[PDB]
Amino acid sequence: TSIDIEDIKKILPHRYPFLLVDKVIYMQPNKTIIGLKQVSTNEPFFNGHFPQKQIMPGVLQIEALAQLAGILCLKSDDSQKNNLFLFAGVDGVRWKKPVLPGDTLTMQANLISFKIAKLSGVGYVNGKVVINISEMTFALS
Amino acid sequence: DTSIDIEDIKKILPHRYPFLLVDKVIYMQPNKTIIGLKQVSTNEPFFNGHFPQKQIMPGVLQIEALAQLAGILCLKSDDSQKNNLFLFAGVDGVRWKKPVLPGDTLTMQANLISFKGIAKLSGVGYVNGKVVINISEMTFAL
Amino acid sequence: DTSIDIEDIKKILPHRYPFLLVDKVIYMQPNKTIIGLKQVSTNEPFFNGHFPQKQIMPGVLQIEALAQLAGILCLKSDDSQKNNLFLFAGVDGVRWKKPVLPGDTLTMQANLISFKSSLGIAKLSGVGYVNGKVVINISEMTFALS
Amino acid sequence: TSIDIEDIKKILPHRYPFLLVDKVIYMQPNKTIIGLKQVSTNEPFFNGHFPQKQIMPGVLQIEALAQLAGILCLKSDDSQKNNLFLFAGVDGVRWKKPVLPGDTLTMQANLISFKSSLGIAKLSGVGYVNGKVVINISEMTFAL
Amino acid sequence: DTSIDIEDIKKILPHRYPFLLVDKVIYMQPNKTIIGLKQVSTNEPFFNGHFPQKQIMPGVLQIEALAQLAGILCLKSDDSQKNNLFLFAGVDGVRWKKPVLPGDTLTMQANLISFKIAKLSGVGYVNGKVVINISEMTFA
Amino acid sequence: DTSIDIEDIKKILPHRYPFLLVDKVIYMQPNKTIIGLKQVSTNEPFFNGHFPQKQIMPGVLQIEALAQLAGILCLKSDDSQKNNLFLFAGVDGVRWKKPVLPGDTLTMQANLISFKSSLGIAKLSGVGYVNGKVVINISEMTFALS
Numbered sequence A: 001t002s003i004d005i006e007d008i009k010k011i012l013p014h015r016y017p018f019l020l021v022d023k024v025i026y027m028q029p030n031k032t033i034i035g036l037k038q039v040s041t042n043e044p045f046f047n048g049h050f051p052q053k054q055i056m057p058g059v060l061q062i063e064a065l066a067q068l069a070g071i072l073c074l075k076s077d078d079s080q081k082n083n084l085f086l087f088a089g090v091d092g093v094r095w096k097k098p099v100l101p102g103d104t105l106t107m108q109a110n111l112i113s114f115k116i117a118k119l120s121g122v123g124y125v126n127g128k129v130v131i132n133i134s135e136m137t138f139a140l141s
Numbered sequence B: 001d002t003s004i005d006i007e008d009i010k011k012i013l014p015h016r017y018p019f020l021l022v023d024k025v026i027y028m029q030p031n032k033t034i035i036g037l038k039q040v041s042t043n044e045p046f047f048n049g050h051f052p053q054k055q056i057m058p059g060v061l062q063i064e065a066l067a068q069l070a071g072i073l074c075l076k077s078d079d080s081q082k083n084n085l086f087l088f089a090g091v092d093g094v095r096w097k098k099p100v101l102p103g104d105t106l107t108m109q110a111n112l113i114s115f116k117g118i119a120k121l122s123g124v125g126y127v128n129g130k131v132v133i134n135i136s137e138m139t140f141a142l
Numbered sequence C, F: 001d002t003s004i005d006i007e008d009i010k011k012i013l014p015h016r017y018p019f020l021l022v023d024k025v026i027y028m029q030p031n032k033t034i035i036g037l038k039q040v041s042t043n044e045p046f047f048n049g050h051f052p053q054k055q056i057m058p059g060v061l062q063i064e065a066l067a068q069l070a071g072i073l074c075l076k077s078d079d080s081q082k083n084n085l086f087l088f089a090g091v092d093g094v095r096w097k098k099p100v101l102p103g104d105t106l107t108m109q110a111n112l113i114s115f116k117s118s119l120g121i122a123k124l125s126g127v128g129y130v131n132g133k134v135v136i137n138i139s140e141m142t143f144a145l146s
Numbered sequence D: 001t002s003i004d005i006e007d008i009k010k011i012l013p014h015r016y017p018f019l020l021v022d023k024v025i026y027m028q029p030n031k032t033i034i035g036l037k038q039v040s041t042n043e044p045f046f047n048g049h050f051p052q053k054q055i056m057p058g059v060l061q062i063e064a065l066a067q068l069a070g071i072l073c074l075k076s077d078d079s080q081k082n083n084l085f086l087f088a089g090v091d092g093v094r095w096k097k098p099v100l101p102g103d104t105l106t107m108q109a110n111l112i113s114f115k116s117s118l119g120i121a122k123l124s125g126v127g128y129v130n131g132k133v134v135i136n137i138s139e140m141t142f143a144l
Numbered sequence E: 001d002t003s004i005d006i007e008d009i010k011k012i013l014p015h016r017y018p019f020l021l022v023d024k025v026i027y028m029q030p031n032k033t034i035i036g037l038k039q040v041s042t043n044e045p046f047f048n049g050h051f052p053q054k055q056i057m058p059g060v061l062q063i064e065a066l067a068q069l070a071g072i073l074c075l076k077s078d079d080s081q082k083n084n085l086f087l088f089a090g091v092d093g094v095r096w097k098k099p100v101l102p103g104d105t106l107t108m109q110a111n112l113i114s115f116k117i118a119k120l121s122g123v124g125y126v127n128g129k130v131v132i133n134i135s136e137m138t139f140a
Ligand SMILES: Clc1cccc(COc2ccc(Cl)c3cccnc23)c1
Pocket: D055, D056, D057, D058, D059, D095, D097, D098, D099, E012, E013, E014, E015, E066, E067, E068, E069, E070, E071, E072, E084, E085, E086, E087, E088
């Protein structure tokens, strides 16, 4: 079920400057989620990273995916009345290609286990893989 | 032709954050037309104020994005006057047709009409192949 | 002669930092005209980008200022629809004459021309001044109640 | 003489979001300076002070007068080629009236003493909205 | 544990970002003394302005932080006056001794002198060292 | 001493506000280990969005923090290459044990494992502490010299 940006902030507690999901285009509960984060020069981190070369910081690509991952969790089982999810561990992260101003970062997250929730995440720009995440781990606290 | 990425955009335009609204230039023909894009993310400083309860890209910011793209065109068309500080002099016939929202790609084209400094240009911006804004005439001064 | 202060403007308008650009409303007549001001300070977030070597108020933000003021008038002329989300639908005949600089007071007047409850079509003209002298002219602003 | 913001930036090292003089309207070397700071809703401190009632922080009023005091010093004597001035002391500050968005804060600073090249300048300062005193300062002391 | 973490400070002070300058209250004695801290990081908004080539914490922001700390003590000392919007009315005998820099832990103590109309003293330390003295902060 | 203060950090790292997350280097030994710290203040811009109701230091930023300290060690161990623009190639074995909060001092250690300046390729391990106690652990941080 497709989601525009007002409804994301109803699920997630993240606000500016640390909401890194712009749209949710496809979601299947307990299974997968697809979404995007538009990379514009008009974002606050870009001045710091870097003055002479504007490149999306890798860690913020993790955060992006992790957030989209967390939307899936909250919409797969919100029985625990808590939207405050905390990153507990992350493993097998590979950055292949610089994400630059102008790109669309398309993102896919797959639920492995919900016991502590564990997920994987891929990031595409132009159908080409830019980030890989073997395993994001999350523990609503 | 060749794409002018952002680092090279900042070498042409004097605009900086939080008022640089052109992310990439995909095609430019000197003295004629220019196509650019602006990626609209929730991670932009203006969104918290427009509006807290419904994030919509201010319409005047779309004009500003288009007028900056038009400005790139002018400076590469004739830099004989190597002053990059161009000021908006007039704008005419602006119609916004659809809300530009976070998640969108604002695709933009500007068209040089006349040039002498005084230059005139038309602008159009699209999201998903659909017209979001039209500008008959942007007028500019050196 | 109602004097409206930033807290009460924040009750009318859904705009917030950094895109609220009316600081005060000095005169308002419902269904007719509104006069207000915006103080122009170096200490605004837009000025670092426009421009590094020469701070000048972006003309579009002068458009926005006058629009927001105009939209105040609209919501105090007719709030029967309790929606405060007005979008810009069209603008026509905009002339910038003088540069608006840090230190200036931007006195603004918007006049209501037509108000159609058909589509939510309100139409307004707008003039901005610094020191009694015209800095911006707008022949027609068109707005759409969402 | 009147001084624009562009020239203010030539004299003062202060940059956004800590430059609090928008215009110098009258200056006399070695004696007195007059200047203004336009107070808009569109400043980054206003969200923090305070969400529910927007009041210009008093310490920022002190800063604004201090920056204006600073300009006068640098134009009264720039034999010391150093624009980086440090507040060393402040005495006799009184806030009378809340400074609000939409106000013009007109400021005046009066040089009291200058030790040329110990770098110790002393000055007084007053701030006004609408002809009415909003801030008094008995003595700013600076480390040049 | 006689202290107050950030979430609890925000229930006391109306101040928010970018003008909340107390991170943690480590000791407090009602009607007497308050000890607090503020961590000084390059990643703070004011440091780009002051100064581009030499990051120094604005002295007035040292005054503001101490005053904020003093403000918590007042309110926890007597909240019968049901108002958390305190205004600075005056400040006296402020002396800056040393620059405060990114990386320092600004440790601050404010001492209540008189109430009802509140007057207090303030001292700031980096590494035991006195960075700022305030003889008298006046509140109403 | 072996202490680099913020000014010298900014000569080594290209990072600026709001993405410079090493405040001070307290001990460094070239080609081996580095100890630095990041001061956690409520007066940082990320805290407003993470989270409104509960200010917690984004875990990812704790990675960046460590990686930037890792980078300082690499650029001082070997600056053969006239390039300070290090990109994160991959990260591995990250655990977050305890929330980092406004008021904490994040004390950080990164250790060099392997370096081949032939390619411009380095690997590092990292641990973050608050009050002597572990808050973050990182098995492997991999970085490219681009
Ligand atoms: Cl006109 C003006 C100028 C500067 C600061 C202020 C008020 O500062 C405060 C507000 C709220 C609280 Cl609860 C405080 C507490 C302590 C110190 N200052 C406080 C008023």
